[PDB]
Design a protein around this ligand. Structure first.
Ligand code: CYT
Ligand code: CYT
Ligand code: CL
Lengths: 259, 259
């Protein structure tokens, strides 16, 4: 029940990226943004404190943090006294930075800081309003083959239809994904079908955004590209991987409808 | 994977209420409001659809619905084709009504209906900003003994500090609770301590709001009382039990910061 930094568990980013056939020199930059909805500890008099945490881990870090460990580690704060909120933020910064292996930023925000904050949508045009018949729910990266055959355009497209099963639990993981690019026009039927083909496939969040990035770069060869997914929480935590050929982070961490 | 109304599981409301020593004639009215964050099915062409559901179950119903069943039942929609959104809403209304045993209302809302909706706080004065030393985290209803000893007032008090372990999983369940009353002034230290004493205790949401109601009525004897808790989601679903001596439902189902 007492605070225990030894609970966290790293996962090497290299494993997954060795699978996308990715080098020691990265095609993307960016970050993994996490929202910690159920962050709670005790003050020095034993009264519970509650807050929301917002964390950003560099995509260049050696490790990401094993989700179930991130969760037990947050749990250990629940019955531990800390004298001030800054103490808590200091601990979160240190431990998450040490686990991931690169400085991680952490904001600890009190709940009143969320009063009147609006729900946001994604940028760009939603592509989910298509009258197409759906074939696959098994994955197929070659769904993007031939998808970019137009005039060179600057677009942002998004879909709320991304879903995949957790490698571990096999329950669905739900998300919206935003794809900004400059290059030959992407066919929206192909792209939507590509996204939908994740449905019954087993995938991990960070792994997912990186695969979408590398498949689009491969198949559609834009000049520039950004892929950003925003997933709904599991066990009090949500993950929002951002990967770009030029931008290092999104402008804010505002929540979407399902999050 | 296909839609299966047989998945739902009722739990008699009478079991819990036989434990609060409550009669066949109810001291409260109200409802259980649920938000279904991850509601998804296929259209008649096999393309996924996503929505948020908002459900209200009468507190007078014979049963509530076993949470893990509610969850598997929603899952069964995920790979099932339905020709229209209204078909889906019709099915949800029927099945949840049949399970609970009284008409349940259901709204199925598209995600764009949430664009720009604000995060709300609770009504009344927060009582969590107290410089008191905390003793218990084991439950004690008699924490309210002697708590109401003032002038007769009309107040609304709320706390974001409600937490208890799930009877099943023993992980914490997190919530904010809003207490509106007219009657002798409640001591805020007592009330806060009473609420905090749920922390390490094992409780069920609906059971929890009903116990807070009956303990306050017992110990503090207000003329009128409303207890409303809003919990954070588990497995895509949140529960918001509302119990009142005069009001049958809250004015809206707007989400709070942690939800
Ligand atoms: N288990 C995990 C799932 C998703 N992201 C992680 O970092 N870890
Ligand atoms: N298992 C459950 C937990 C909370 N509420 C329910 O209705 N069921
Ligand atoms: Cl969850």
């Amino acid at each position: 029940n007492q605070y225990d930094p030894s609970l966290l568990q790293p996962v090497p980013r290299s494993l997954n990226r060795n699978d996308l056939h990715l080098s020691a020199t990265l095609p993307f930059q960016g970050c993994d943004i996490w929202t910690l909805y159920e962050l709670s500890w005790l003050n020095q008099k034993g009264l519970p404190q509650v807050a929301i945490g917002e964390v950003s881990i560099p995509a260049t870090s050696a490790n990401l943090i094993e989700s179930k460990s991130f969760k037990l580690y947050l749990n250990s704060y629940n019955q531990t006294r800390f004298a001030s909120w800054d103490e808590v933020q200091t601990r979160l910064v240190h431990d998450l930075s040490a686990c991931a292996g690169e400085t991680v930023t952490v904001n600890v925000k009190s709940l009143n800081e969320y009063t009147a904050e609006p729900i946001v949508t994604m940028q760009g045009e939603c592509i989910d309003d298509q009258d197409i018949e759906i074939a696959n729910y098994e994955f197929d990266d070659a769904l993007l083959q031939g998808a970019a055959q137009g005039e060179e355009v600057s677009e942002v497209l998004h879909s709320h239809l991304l879903k995949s099963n957790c490698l571990i639990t096999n329950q669905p993981d739900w998300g919206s994904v935003e794809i900004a690019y400059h290059g030959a026009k992407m066919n929206r039927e192909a792209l939507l079908r590509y996204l939908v083909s994740f449905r019954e496939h087993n995938e991990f969040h960070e792994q997912c955004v990186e695969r979408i990035f590398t498949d689009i770069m491969r198949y559609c060869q834009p000049q520039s590209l950004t892929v950003y997914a925003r997933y709904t929480r599991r066990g009090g935590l949500d993950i929002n991987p951002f990967r770009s050929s030029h931008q290092s982070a999104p402008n804010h961490n505002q929540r979407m409808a399902r999050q």
